[PDB]
Amino acid sequence: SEFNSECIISYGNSPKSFYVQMKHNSADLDLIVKTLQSKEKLKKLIDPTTNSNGVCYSQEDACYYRCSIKSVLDPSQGFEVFLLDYGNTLVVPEVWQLPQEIEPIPSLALHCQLSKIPMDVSDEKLEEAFAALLEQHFGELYEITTQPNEDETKPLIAELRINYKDFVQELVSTVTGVQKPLEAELHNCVVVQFDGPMSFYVQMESDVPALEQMTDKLLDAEQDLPAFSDLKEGALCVAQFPEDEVFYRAQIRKVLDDGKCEVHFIDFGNNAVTQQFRQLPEELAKPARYSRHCELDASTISKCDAALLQSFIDTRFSETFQVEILATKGTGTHVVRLFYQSKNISEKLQECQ
C-alpha cells in the first residue's frame, strides 16, 4: 500500500477508476522510458496470449510502451493492450518482446478508485467534473493513501489529497455548482521554525497523526537500522539529532569532513550536524515530508514590518495558526497567506499584536 505518498494521475476518466504514478518510482519510470529508446531489433510474443507482456508502438505518441495483452483479436487488427506504466488502452497491430533489462520492473501505474463517490450522480456528470479537476491542477503533485481491496478484480481504494484539500470534497463541489466554505481555504498548523517571511516551516495539524506514527515506526525499527555510508548530497536516510539523540528522517544538506554532515530534518524542518547515519527503509521513504516549507505572498510581505512579524511568531511558537495556500513553487515550498485566529497576520500585527 501507499500512505501519504506523492503522485500524479497518469490516466483516468471517472473517480471510479484511474491511474497513478508514484514520485517514489520516478527513478524507474525514467529508466523504462530512456532504456526504451534503444527498430532493427524486435520479436513476437510467446504465442501472444492474455496477460502476456511485451512492447508496442503508439502512432499517436510516436513512441514505445510496456504492453500487456488484454484481448487477442482477429489478425485484421492486432490486440487490445493495456499500457503498464500509464493505464491507457490502445489497439496495437503488433507486439514484441520485453527487453531483458526492463522485463523485471513491475507495472508502474497503480489502478485506483476514490474511497467515496457521490451517490446518485450520472457518470456523464462525474466524469465531467473529474476531468475538470484533473485539468484544474495538472503539473502539481497529488498525495495518495491506498489500501488493497476485497475483490482482486477491482481497483485499489484510494484517498486523494491535493493542496491539503480532500479530492472528493472538490469533486462534490464541482459536481453541484455549490461554492464552498472559505474556511476550507484555511488550514490549522504550527510554525515549527521561523527565520524570515521568505522562509519558515510549519506542520499541518491534519498531518500530526501521520507524523506521530512515523515517529513510532522509526523508534521501533530504530535499533535495527543499518548504517548509512554513501554520504552524497541530498541523500535520504535516518539521522540522529544531537540535542535529542533520536533518529529522524533526514536529508544531507552539506557533506562535511569526517563522517559528519549537516542534515535537514524533513519532518521537523530544522537543521543540525550529526555523526550518526542509518539507512531509511523504502516503507518509510514513501510518505511526503511532514514539515512544510513556506514563504508569504508578496502583498503580505509588503504590508508587514519584518520586525514585528518575527517577534509575534516567537511569542506564539507553539500556538496554532492557519495557512491559505496560493501556490507551490517548483522546489516544493508553498507561497501562502498566514492567519492568526482567522484574522490575517498583517491585520493582527497592526493594533498591538
| CATH number, position 321 | 2.40.50.790
Residue 129 to residue 166: CA distance in whole angstroms: 15
Last residue within a domain, chosen from 287, 314, 332: 287
Is 266 found in the same domain as 166? no
Is 266 found in the same domain as 226? yes
Is 137 found in the same domain as 18? yes
CA nearest 14: which of 167, 151, 180, 179? Answer: 167
Residue 97 to residue 82: CA distance in whole angstroms: 15
Last residue within a domain, chosen from 231, 257, 287: 287
- Using the Cα atoms of residue 54, residue 59, residue 60 and residue 61 in order, give the sign of their dihedral: positive
Expressed as residue numbers, the domain containing 24 is 1-37+104-178
Residue 312 to residue 351: CA distance in whole angstroms: 12
Is 52 found in the same domain as 25? no
Last residue within a domain, chosen from 267, 287, 307: 287
Three-state secondary structure along the chain? CCCCEEEEEEEEEECCEEEEEEHHHHHHHHHHHHCCCCCCCCCCCCCCCCCCCCEEEECCCCEEEECCEEEECCCCCCEEEECCCCCCEEEECCCCCCCCCCCCCCCCCEEEEECCCCCCCCHHHHHHHHHHHHHCCCCCCEEEEEECCCCCCCCEEEEEEECCEEHHHHHHHHHCCCCCCHHHHEEEEEEEEECCCCCEEEEEHHHHHHHHHHHHHHHHHHCCCCECCCCCCCCEEEEEECCCCEEEEEEEEEECCCCCEEEEECCCCEEEEECCCECCCHHHCCECCCCEEEEECHHHHHHCCHHHHHHHHHHCCCCEEEEEEEEECCCCCEEEEEEECCEEHHHHHCCCC
Is 146 found in the same domain as 32? yes
C-beta of residue 338 within 8 angstroms of C-beta of residue 295: no
**Method used to determine the 3D structure:** X-ray
Q: How many domains does the chain have?
A: 4
Residue 280 to residue 299: CA distance in whole angstroms: 40
Residue indicated by cell numbers 511569542: 315
Is 211 found in the same domain as 282? yes
Is 174 found in the same domain as 126? yes
